[PDB]
Amino acid sequence: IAIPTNFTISVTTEILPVSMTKTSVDCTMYICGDSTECSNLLLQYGSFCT
Amino acid sequence: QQFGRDIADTTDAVRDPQTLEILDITPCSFGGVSVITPGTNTSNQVAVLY
């Protein structure tokens, strides 16, 4: 058998992500900017932005 | 240089042909509004976060 006659105390680092960046997108402003008729066309696609 | 654009290629600033001043263009549609409500069941009051 082999038995230890001494010890070492080791500190080791573990790294874990917990969060992302909370991002939001204004669907209408992304797709159509400030064009009224582009927005009207976008209404034809329903609830995709929602 | 007559006008400037952002990463998306959106025109962000222009030069007035006559005065030759630089004007930034910002969308006239604020879509960063949130409404805090305790519920229509309990009250009709609200708060607004811009």
Give B22-42 as a 3 state SS string: EEECCCCCCCCCEEECCCCCC
Q: Is B47 an 8 Å CB contact of chain A? A: no
Contact state of B27 with A33 under an 8 Å Cβ cutoff: yes
CA B35 centroid distance within chain? 18
Q: Name the experiment that determined this structure.
A: cryo-EM
Beta-bridge partner residues of B34: B49
Residue of A nearest to B33 (CA): A26
Are the CB atoms for B5 and B16 separated by under 8 Å?
no
Decide: helix, strand or coil at residue B2. Answer: coil
- Say how many C-beta atoms besides its own lie within 10 A of residue B4's C-beta: 13
One-letter amino acid at B21 equals E
Resolution (A): 2.4
